[model samples]
Target: FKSISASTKMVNGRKITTKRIVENGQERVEVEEDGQLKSLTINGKEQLLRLDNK
Candidate 1:
């Protein structure tokens, strides 16, 4: 699998990061805010989430 990563610092002091993994024509994406996982997707489909304050 091939991986790519990127990050940005928001004006509110929050750090946002994104990563992508590619293999077999499938791409998985992950998003993080302030070092916490906030979203995830595989092949454009969002996966199950278990974050706080649901």
Candidate 2:
């Protein structure tokens, strides 16, 4: 597995830090929003991250 730092320059308004993980031919993103664990996927045809946590 390989991890890369794709840090952003800045975010406006309410903001949060997101953790992106790529492993085993799959990509996952985890973030804390409103005090919840929102895990997402980034491997499908979707333009953005999908809510895999649902």
Candidate 3:
């Protein structure tokens, strides 16, 4: 999923929302989705996220 911006906070009491998700089933990390970074599926409109180690 993508953050609205780089400073998105998902902490101990944080709750995830839909728009915060560029697609479903993906997640947030210390890094962010800044550009063409593909996520799971924006109903096939968004690009697909690949395995990080692959």
Better of 1 and 2 by TM-score: 1
In model 3, what is the error at residue 6, expressed in angstroms? 20
Candidate 1 per-residue lDDT, tens place, 1-54, comes to 665655555647777766777777667877777778777788788767668876
The 10-residue segment of model 2 with minimum total lDDT is 5-14
Q: Give the TM-score of candidate 2.
A: 0.41
Which scores greater on lDDT, model 1 or model 2? 1
Pairs that collide, model 3: none
Task: Give each model a TM-score.
Answer: 0.58, 0.41, 0.19
Which structure among the candidates has the greatest TM-score? 1
Tens-place lDDT per residue, model 3, 1-54, is 453523443546453323333335543433224422333434334454678976
lDDT of model 3, residue 26: 49
Q: Write down the RMSD of candidate 3 (Cα, Å).
A: 10.5
Which parts of model 3 are misplaced by more than 4 Å?
Answer: 1-12, 20-40, 44-54
If the candidates were sorted by their lDDT against the true structure, best first, what order would they fall in? 1, 2, 3
Error of 2 at 21 (Å): 0.8
For all the candidates, what are their Cα RMSDs to the real structure?
A: 6.8, 7.2, 10.5
Winning candidate number (lDDT): 1
